[PDB]
Short mmCIF file of all heavy atoms in Angstrom, two decimals:
data_model
loop_
_atom_site.label_atom_id
_atom_site.label_comp_id
_atom_site.label_asym_id
_atom_site.label_seq_id
_atom_site.Cartn_x
_atom_site.Cartn_y
_atom_site.Cartn_z
N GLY O 20 123.52 65.35 103.26
CA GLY O 20 122.90 66.68 103.25
C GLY O 20 121.66 66.72 102.38
O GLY O 20 121.31 65.72 101.77
N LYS O 21 121.01 67.88 102.31
CA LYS O 21 119.93 68.13 101.37
C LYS O 21 120.39 69.08 100.28
O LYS O 21 121.27 69.90 100.51
CB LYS O 21 118.73 68.77 102.05
CG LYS O 21 117.94 67.86 102.97
CD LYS O 21 116.55 68.42 103.12
CE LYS O 21 115.82 67.89 104.29
NZ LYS O 21 115.89 66.48 104.73
N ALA O 22 119.76 68.97 99.12
CA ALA O 22 120.10 69.75 97.94
C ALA O 22 118.85 70.02 97.12
O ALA O 22 118.41 69.18 96.32
CB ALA O 22 121.13 69.00 97.11
N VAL O 23 118.26 71.19 97.33
CA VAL O 23 116.96 71.53 96.76
C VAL O 23 117.02 72.75 95.86
O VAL O 23 117.99 73.53 95.91
CB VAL O 23 115.88 71.71 97.86
CG1 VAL O 23 115.73 70.43 98.67
CG2 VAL O 23 116.18 72.87 98.79
N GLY O 24 116.00 72.88 95.02
CA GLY O 24 115.86 73.98 94.09
C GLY O 24 114.54 74.69 94.35
O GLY O 24 114.15 74.89 95.50
N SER O 25 113.85 75.05 93.27
CA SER O 25 112.56 75.73 93.36
C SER O 25 111.45 74.87 93.94
O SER O 25 110.46 75.40 94.46
CB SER O 25 112.12 76.24 91.97
OG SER O 25 112.88 77.36 91.60
N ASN O 26 111.58 73.55 93.83
CA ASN O 26 110.51 72.65 94.24
C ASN O 26 111.05 71.25 94.50
O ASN O 26 110.87 70.33 93.70
CB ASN O 26 109.37 72.65 93.21
CG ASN O 26 109.89 72.55 91.78
OD1 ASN O 26 110.61 73.43 91.31
ND2 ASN O 26 109.52 71.48 91.09
N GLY O 27 111.69 71.12 95.65
CA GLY O 27 112.23 69.85 96.10
C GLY O 27 113.57 69.53 95.46
O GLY O 27 114.27 70.41 94.94
N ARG O 28 113.89 68.24 95.49
CA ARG O 28 115.20 67.74 95.15
C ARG O 28 115.62 68.16 93.74
O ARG O 28 114.84 68.03 92.80
CB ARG O 28 115.22 66.21 95.26
CG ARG O 28 115.07 65.69 96.69
CD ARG O 28 114.90 64.19 96.70
NE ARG O 28 116.10 63.52 96.23
CZ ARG O 28 116.16 62.38 95.53
NH1 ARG O 28 115.07 61.73 95.14
NH2 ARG O 28 117.34 61.89 95.19
N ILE O 29 116.85 68.66 93.61
CA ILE O 29 117.45 68.99 92.32
C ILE O 29 117.56 67.76 91.44
O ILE O 29 117.35 67.84 90.22
CB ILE O 29 118.86 69.62 92.50
CG1 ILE O 29 118.74 71.02 93.09
CG2 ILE O 29 119.65 69.66 91.19
CD1 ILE O 29 118.27 72.10 92.13
N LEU O 30 117.87 66.62 92.05
CA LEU O 30 118.00 65.37 91.30
C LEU O 30 116.70 64.88 90.62
O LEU O 30 116.77 64.07 89.69
CB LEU O 30 118.58 64.27 92.19
CG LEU O 30 120.00 64.50 92.71
CD1 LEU O 30 120.50 63.29 93.48
CD2 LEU O 30 120.96 64.85 91.58
N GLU O 31 115.54 65.36 91.07
CA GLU O 31 114.25 65.02 90.46
C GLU O 31 113.79 65.97 89.35
O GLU O 31 112.86 65.64 88.64
CB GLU O 31 113.17 64.95 91.53
CG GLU O 31 113.35 63.81 92.52
CD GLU O 31 112.38 63.86 93.69
OE1 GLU O 31 111.57 64.82 93.82
OE2 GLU O 31 112.43 62.92 94.51
N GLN O 32 114.44 67.12 89.18
CA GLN O 32 114.03 68.07 88.14
C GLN O 32 114.27 67.50 86.73
O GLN O 32 115.22 66.74 86.49
CB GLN O 32 114.75 69.44 88.25
CG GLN O 32 114.63 70.34 89.44
CD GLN O 32 113.21 70.61 89.89
OE1 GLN O 32 112.25 70.50 89.11
NE2 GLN O 32 113.08 71.00 91.15
N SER O 33 113.41 67.89 85.80
CA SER O 33 113.51 67.48 84.40
C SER O 33 114.37 68.46 83.63
O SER O 33 114.20 69.68 83.75
CB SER O 33 112.14 67.43 83.75
OG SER O 33 111.31 66.52 84.44
N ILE O 34 115.28 67.93 82.82
CA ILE O 34 116.07 68.73 81.89
C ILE O 34 115.21 69.10 80.68
O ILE O 34 114.76 68.21 79.95
CB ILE O 34 117.36 67.98 81.47
CG1 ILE O 34 118.35 67.88 82.65
CG2 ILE O 34 118.02 68.65 80.26
CD1 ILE O 34 118.32 66.58 83.39
N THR O 35 114.96 70.39 80.48
CA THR O 35 114.22 70.89 79.31
C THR O 35 115.19 71.48 78.28
O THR O 35 115.14 71.14 77.11
CB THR O 35 113.16 71.93 79.70
OG1 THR O 35 113.79 73.09 80.24
CG2 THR O 35 112.21 71.37 80.74
N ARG O 36 116.07 72.36 78.74
CA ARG O 36 117.17 72.90 77.95
C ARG O 36 118.50 72.35 78.44
O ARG O 36 118.64 71.96 79.59
CB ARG O 36 117.22 74.42 78.07
CG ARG O 36 116.10 75.15 77.37
CD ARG O 36 116.37 76.65 77.31
NE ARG O 36 116.45 77.25 78.65
CZ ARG O 36 117.54 77.76 79.24
NH1 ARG O 36 118.73 77.77 78.65
NH2 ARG O 36 117.42 78.28 80.46
N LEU O 37 119.49 72.33 77.54
CA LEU O 37 120.88 71.98 77.87
C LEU O 37 121.48 72.92 78.92
O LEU O 37 122.10 72.47 79.88
CB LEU O 37 121.73 71.99 76.60
CG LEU O 37 123.21 71.62 76.68
CD1 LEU O 37 123.42 70.17 77.13
CD2 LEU O 37 123.91 71.85 75.35
N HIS O 38 121.28 74.22 78.74
CA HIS O 38 121.87 75.22 79.63
C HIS O 38 120.88 75.74 80.67
O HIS O 38 120.95 76.90 81.09
CB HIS O 38 122.51 76.33 78.80
CG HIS O 38 123.72 75.87 78.05
ND1 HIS O 38 124.96 75.78 78.64
CD2 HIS O 38 123.88 75.43 76.78
CE1 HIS O 38 125.84 75.32 77.76
NE2 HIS O 38 125.21 75.09 76.63
N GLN O 39 119.97 74.87 81.10
CA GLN O 39 118.92 75.21 82.05
C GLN O 39 119.52 75.63 83.39
O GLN O 39 120.39 74.95 83.90
CB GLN O 39 118.02 74.00 82.26
CG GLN O 39 116.83 74.18 83.20
CD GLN O 39 116.02 72.90 83.34
OE1 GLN O 39 116.05 72.02 82.49
NE2 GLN O 39 115.27 72.79 84.43
N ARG O 40 119.02 76.73 83.94
CA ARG O 40 119.47 77.20 85.23
C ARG O 40 118.53 76.75 86.32
O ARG O 40 117.40 76.36 86.04
CB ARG O 40 119.57 78.72 85.23
CG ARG O 40 120.61 79.26 84.25
CD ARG O 40 120.62 80.77 84.30
NE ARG O 40 121.33 81.38 83.18
CZ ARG O 40 122.64 81.58 83.12
NH1 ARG O 40 123.45 81.20 84.10
NH2 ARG O 40 123.16 82.14 82.03
N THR O 41 119.00 76.79 87.56
CA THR O 41 118.19 76.46 88.75
C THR O 41 118.73 77.17 89.98
O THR O 41 119.94 77.33 90.11
CB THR O 41 118.14 74.95 89.05
OG1 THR O 41 117.51 74.73 90.32
CG2 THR O 41 119.54 74.33 89.08
N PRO O 42 117.83 77.62 90.87
CA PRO O 42 118.35 78.08 92.16
C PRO O 42 118.86 76.89 92.95
O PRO O 42 118.46 75.75 92.66
CB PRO O 42 117.11 78.70 92.82
CG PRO O 42 115.95 78.07 92.16
CD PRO O 42 116.37 77.79 90.76
N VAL O 43 119.73 77.14 93.93
CA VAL O 43 120.23 76.06 94.79
C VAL O 43 120.21 76.45 96.25
O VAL O 43 120.47 77.59 96.58
CB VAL O 43 121.65 75.58 94.38
CG1 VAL O 43 121.67 75.10 92.94
CG2 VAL O 43 122.70 76.64 94.59
N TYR O 44 119.86 75.48 97.09
CA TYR O 44 119.93 75.59 98.54
C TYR O 44 120.49 74.27 99.04
O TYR O 44 119.76 73.29 99.22
CB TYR O 44 118.53 75.87 99.13
CG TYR O 44 117.78 76.95 98.37
CD1 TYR O 44 116.89 76.63 97.37
CD2 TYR O 44 118.00 78.31 98.64
CE1 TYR O 44 116.21 77.62 96.66
CE2 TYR O 44 117.34 79.30 97.94
CZ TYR O 44 116.44 78.95 96.95
OH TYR O 44 115.76 79.92 96.25
N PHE O 45 121.81 74.21 99.19
CA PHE O 45 122.55 72.95 99.38
C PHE O 45 123.20 72.98 100.75
O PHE O 45 123.73 74.02 101.14
CB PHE O 45 123.68 72.83 98.33
CG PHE O 45 123.22 72.44 96.94
CD1 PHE O 45 121.88 72.45 96.55
CD2 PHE O 45 124.18 72.09 95.99
CE1 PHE O 45 121.51 72.10 95.26
CE2 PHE O 45 123.80 71.72 94.70
CZ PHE O 45 122.47 71.73 94.33
N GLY O 46 123.18 71.87 101.48
CA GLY O 46 124.01 71.78 102.68
C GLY O 46 123.50 70.88 103.77
O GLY O 46 122.89 69.85 103.51
N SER O 47 123.82 71.26 105.01
CA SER O 47 123.37 70.57 106.20
C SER O 47 121.85 70.46 106.17
O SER O 47 121.18 71.45 105.90
CB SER O 47 123.80 71.35 107.44
OG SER O 47 125.21 71.41 107.58
N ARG O 48 121.33 69.27 106.46
CA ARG O 48 119.89 68.99 106.29
C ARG O 48 118.99 69.93 107.14
O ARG O 48 118.01 70.46 106.62
CB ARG O 48 119.60 67.48 106.48
CG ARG O 48 119.83 66.93 107.87
CD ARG O 48 119.60 65.42 107.90
NE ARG O 48 119.73 64.95 109.28
CZ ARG O 48 118.79 65.10 110.22
NH1 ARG O 48 117.61 65.70 109.98
NH2 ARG O 48 119.05 64.64 111.45
N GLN O 49 119.38 70.20 108.39
CA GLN O 49 118.63 71.13 109.25
C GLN O 49 118.75 72.59 108.84
O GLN O 49 117.82 73.36 109.06
CB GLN O 49 119.01 70.98 110.72
CG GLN O 49 118.57 69.65 111.30
CD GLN O 49 119.10 69.41 112.70
OE1 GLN O 49 119.61 70.32 113.35
NE2 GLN O 49 118.97 68.18 113.18
#
C-alpha cells in the first residue's frame, strides 16, 4: 500500500519533536 502525510511518504519525514504529529492517508495504493 501507500502511506503518506503532508508531503509524500511518512517514512521520509524528519523527527523534530518526540511527540510530533502528522496527518495520515494510508491504504490501497489507488
Side-chain angles (χ1 to χ4, degrees):
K21 288 202 198 321
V23 301
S25 286
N26 45 298
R28 292 172 66 214
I29 289 285
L30 297 185
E31 294 172 356
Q32 298 311 336
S33 300
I34 290 98
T35 65
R36 289 191 297 112
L37 182 63
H38 291 279
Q39 182 181 338
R40 296 179 194 276
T41 171
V43 302
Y44 314 95
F45 284 12
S47 296
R48 66 184 185 77
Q49 292 173 12

